Design a protein around this ligand. Structure first.
Ligand SMILES: [Mg+2]
Ligand SMILES: [Mg+2]
Ligand SMILES: [Mg+2]
Ligand SMILES: [Mg+2]
Ligand SMILES: [Mg+2]
Ligand SMILES: [Mg+2]
Ligand SMILES: [Mg+2]
Ligand SMILES: [Mg+2]
Ligand SMILES: [Mg+2]
Ligand SMILES: [Mg+2]
Ligand SMILES: [Zn+2]
Lengths: 97, 100, 214, 87, 127, 249
RNA sequence: GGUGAAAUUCUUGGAUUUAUUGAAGACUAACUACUGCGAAAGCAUUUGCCAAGGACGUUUUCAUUAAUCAAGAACGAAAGUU
């Protein structure tokens, strides 16, 4: 499941945490897949989700809020939205999730 | 008082403390193991009908089913009438189903 | 002192229509007096009767069928397959000792607003040759079978607008599809549906009913 | 550890008696503590006048129970409606 | 041709109903029971009363105009016995002997899935 | 004798409530067209403690369907509403905590509050903290639901009666004891003027039936007739039972 | 209704009985065994999630980490208690 796969990214893989860096990297186009939390506000969910469609990027909805996504990406602090720029070792890019 | 039996309550072996079953007659809670779980496969109609029912009936062959009362008895309750039947010390080792 | 046995009416029940007959028998009510009418009273009556009464044969004398009265049209009142049932005596014989039984409950919205719940008895087979007195399926297998039977009854219910779902249910066609898929996991015997319960139903759609009466 | 067991209710000193101190302690813990904010993510503080929480670092405000963000009744009724919405 | 009732014989211990109905269930025909037909209090369950209860149902059936019945049976159920009474089967003879026709017999005794507690308490009825 | 402590109350001079701090008449929207056919989105702008209230209020803002203007209405906040929630009111709105249907649209089992007794009452039943009606039944022939009220007393209501879904906020207030008079003081000081109550018994037989005697005691049944009288009615009025009540309500 | 042999006890201005539901908070039968797991206590309707676990297998790895244990702990039926 997803948590195993984001662990596979965070060890050996390039990934961005949080919004501004996400967006920076949606506009650069480096973002291949962004993992948005739930609790992250619908505005900023819908904003990412817009940018995503211009960048033709996958948006995986991590079922669960932002304290438990930080967990899932081997972080302490809460993270509202992750990007996966490159993580060829992992299978989240291949997976629909 | 030594052991009468090796089993005692029987099913319970390698199995902490199982659930119980209310008996039929006395409504005496007994473990579903100590329970004397006889099967009463009785006909829905008593033998001394049965002709009479089939005479007045519609159709042929008929359902003529059997009710399946899986009884239980609180050992005491069972002894007072039922399959129990107080056996001899040497005969108490036998687990064989009786009759048949 | 009133005695309403004279003050009575005899109307006819109307089966519909994947079975043999389109008539079951003969209930009764009082007349359509002021305030308390006869047509409004009769809608919401469920005639649970055998499935060997309708189809005639004794293969379906292992079943029952609830028949909910929705409309009354010129004495003759109609019904709808509200639910399915076994009589108690039939399933209890099939549950014998020294083998596993399996159930499978499946909630499913049809194409119409009809939230059908459907169950599925399915005993484990005392296999040919056996000397293990038992026939006990390992939990893991029954947790697949219960999944597979659900994967069946999500597919054949939901689809085909509920009225045809009866036409599949009546002659145990769904019941073999269970057996066939499950033999890869574990053999199993008997396999029926036992019950089909019903939760939701829309506004009558008075005239949706009579599509089964002609 | 200051207090073996008066805990917070040690404001009240020797008044009111061990039962009515205990009862309150339970709910003056609950009410003075910090939730976690459903939306923000964050966790500090905040109740402010019975059944009205909060702001952490955000400012919303949320009707809760008197002494806790969610009374158990609310959660079960959330379910009751979760079930009856799905019908 | 055969108009159908549903006899529904509640023969618990210490009592026997015989309750003929329509197939929907709603509109009854009779409700003749044991303690109705014999004023002895004791002799409700007994065959005599069950016979005499069913024949009065048989008479009350033919007047209104029923030919046959579906013999359902109900022993007490659940929190009591679950065991068919003495005048359940003595009712079935009386339904047959009268000439009231018989088709599809059941015992729909509601044997619970996992009953809520019985009488008696843990040690039971200690006579 | 005198007029009693509890005959004057009626007169209403002092025993009038206090409505300085008191925020607004806690009430639903007025009914029709919009919310007797489809629905409308409110918006919860504030959740706000009300002085002298079982459970806080919500200034839920809607839109006038006939003028360019907003109306703000003080609903009784149900545990769940939160500033910037979208409340939806009226027939076609859905079952969610804060929406406001009419009992008709609301399946049996549901849990409702500010239930209008008659429709167009703008709320009556189950408005205090933590309380809620349960819609038990439905009589679509003569459209009228059966509804249980916190008391228990089940009661038939018009199916066009409304009520906000959810249980009310401030739930489990009375858990806490008050301790200290003073907190009881500040409770009532913000409502009305009933608090401290002297016991008839303690007072002089001038001032209250129970009063007087060389021992503080009543001396003639604290139960009182229902067909009694202003000034007779101090003690257990129209009791059925009395004494320590065992078991269910 | 109840009856243990026997009674009392309840409604009829159809209680009960018959059928459709609703609420609530229960349990979670039949299978169910000289069966399973759990340190015990204890645990059987469902799926789901959460971590844990025994056995098993293993030409895996560390290399004495091990057994039992007064102090201290963790759980701990029912009842009782706020
Ligand atoms: Mg001795
Ligand atoms: Mg001895
Ligand atoms: Mg000794
Ligand atoms: Mg063991
Ligand atoms: Mg044990
Ligand atoms: Mg007693
Ligand atoms: Mg097993
Ligand atoms: Mg079971
Ligand atoms: Mg020690
Ligand atoms: Mg206990
Ligand atoms: Zn017994």
């Amino acid at each position: 499941n997803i948590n195993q796969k984001l662990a596979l990214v965070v060890k050996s893989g390039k990934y961005s945490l949080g919004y501004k860096s996400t967006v920076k990297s949606l506009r650069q186009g480096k973002a291949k897949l962004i993992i948005i939390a739930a609790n992250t506000p619908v505005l900023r969910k819908s904003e990412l989700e817009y940018y995503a469609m211009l960048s033709k990027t996958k948006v995986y909805y991590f079922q669960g809020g932002n304290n438990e996504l930080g967990t899932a990406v081997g972080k302490l602090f809460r993270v509202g939205v992750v990007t996966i720029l490159d993580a060829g070792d992992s299978d989240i890019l291949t997976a629909l999730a | 008082m030594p052991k009468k039996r090796a089993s005692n309550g029987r099913n319970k072996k390698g199995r902490g403390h199982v659930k119980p079953v209310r008996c039929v007659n006395c409504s005496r809670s007994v473990p579903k193991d100590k329970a004397i779980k006889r099967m009463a496969i009785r006909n829905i109609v008593e033998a001394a009908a049965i002709r009479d029912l089939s005479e007045a009936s519609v159709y042929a062959e008929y359902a003529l089913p059997k009710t399946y009362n899986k009884l239980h008895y609180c050992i005491s309750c069972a002894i007072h009438a039922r399959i129990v039947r107080v056996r001899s010390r040497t005969d108490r080792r036998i687990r064989a189903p009786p009759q048949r | 002192v009133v005695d309403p046995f004279t003050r009575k009416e005899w109307y006819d029940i109307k089966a519909p229509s994947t079975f043999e007959n389109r008539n079951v028998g003969k209930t009764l009510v009082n007349k359509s007096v002021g305030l308390k009418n006869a047509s409004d009273s009769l809608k919401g009556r469920v005639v649970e009767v055998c499935l060997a009464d309708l189809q005639g044969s004794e293969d379906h004398s292992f079943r029952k069928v609830k028949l909910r009265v929705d409309e009354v049209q010129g004495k003759n009142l109609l019904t709808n397959f509200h639910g399915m049932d076994f009589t108690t005596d039939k399933l209890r014989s099939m549950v014998r000792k020294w083998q596993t039984l399996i159930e499978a409950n499946v909630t499913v919205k049809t194409s119409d607003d009809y939230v059908l719940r459907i169950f599925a008895i399915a005993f484990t087979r005392k296999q040919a040759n056996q000397v293990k007195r038992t026939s006990y399926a390992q939990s893991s297998h029954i947790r697949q079978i219960r999944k597979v039977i659900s994967e069946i009854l999500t597919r054949e219910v939901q689809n085909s607008t509920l009225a045809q779902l009866t036409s599949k249910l009546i002659p145990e066609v769904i019941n073999k599809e269970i057996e066939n898929a499950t033999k890869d996991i574990f053999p199993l015997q008997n396999v029926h549906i036992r019950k089909v319960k019903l939760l939701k139903q829309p506004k009558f759609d008075l005239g949706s009913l009579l599509s089964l009466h002609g | 550890k200051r207090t073996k067991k008066v805990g917070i209710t040690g404001k009240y000193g020797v008044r009111y008696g061990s039962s009515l101190r205990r009862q309150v302690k339970k709910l003056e813990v609950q009410q003075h503590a910090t939730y976690n904010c459903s939306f923000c993510g964050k966790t500090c503080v905040k109740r402010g006048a019975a059944g009205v929480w909060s702001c952490s670092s955000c400012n919303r405000t949320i009707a809760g129970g008197a002494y806790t963000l969610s009374t158990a009744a609310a959660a079960t009724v959330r379910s009751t409606i979760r079930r009856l919405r799905d019908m | 041709s055969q108009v159908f009732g549903v006899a529904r014989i509640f023969a618990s211990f210490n009592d026997t109903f015989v309750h003929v109905t329509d197939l929907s269930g709603r509109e009854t025909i009779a409700r003749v029971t044991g303690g109705m037909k014999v004023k002895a209090d004791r002799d409700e369950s007994s065959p005599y009363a069950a016979m005499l209860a069913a024949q009065d149902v048989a008479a009350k059936c033919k007047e209104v105009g029923i030919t046959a019945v579906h013999i359902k049976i109900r022993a007490t159920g659940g929190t009591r016995s679950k065991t068919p009474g003495p005048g359940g089967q003595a009712a079935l003879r009386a339904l047959a002997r009268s000439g009231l026709r018989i088709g599809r017999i059941e015992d729909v005794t509601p044997v619970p899935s996992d009953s809520t507690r019985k009488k008696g308490g843990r040690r039971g009825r200690r006579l | 004798g005198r007029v009693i402590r509890n005959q004057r109350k009626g007169a209403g001079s002092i025993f009038t409530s206090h409505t300085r701090l008191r925020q607004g008449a806690a009430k639903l929207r007025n009914l029709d067209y919009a919310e007797r056919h489809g629905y409308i989105r409110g918006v919860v702008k504030q959740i706000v403690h009300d002085a002298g209230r079982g459970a806080p209020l919500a200034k839920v803002v809607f839109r006038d369907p006939y003028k360019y203007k907003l109306r703000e209405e003080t609903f009784i906040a149900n545990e769940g509403l939160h500033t910037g929630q979208f409340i939806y009111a009226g027939k076609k709105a859905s079952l969610n905590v804060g929406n406001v249907l009419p009992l008709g649209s609301v399946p049996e089992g549901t849990i409702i509050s500010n239930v209008e007794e008659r429709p167009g009452d703008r709320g009556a039943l189950a408005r205090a903290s933590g309380n809620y009606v349960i819609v038990i039944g439905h009589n679509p022939e003569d459209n009228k639901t059966r509804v249980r009220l916190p008391s228990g007393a089940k009661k038939i209501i018009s199916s066009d009666a409304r009520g906000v879904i959810g249980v009310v906020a401030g739930g489990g207030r009375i858990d806490k004891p008050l301790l200290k008079a003073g907190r009881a003081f500040h409770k009532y000081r913000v409502k009305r003027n009933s608090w401290p109550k002297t016991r008839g018994v303690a007072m002089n037989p001038v001032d209250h039936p129970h009063g007087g005697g060389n021992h503080q005691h009543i001396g003639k049944a604290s139960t009182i007739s229902r067909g009694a009288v202003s000034g007779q009615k101090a003690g257990l009025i129209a009791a059925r039972r009395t004494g320590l009540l065992r078991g269910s309500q």
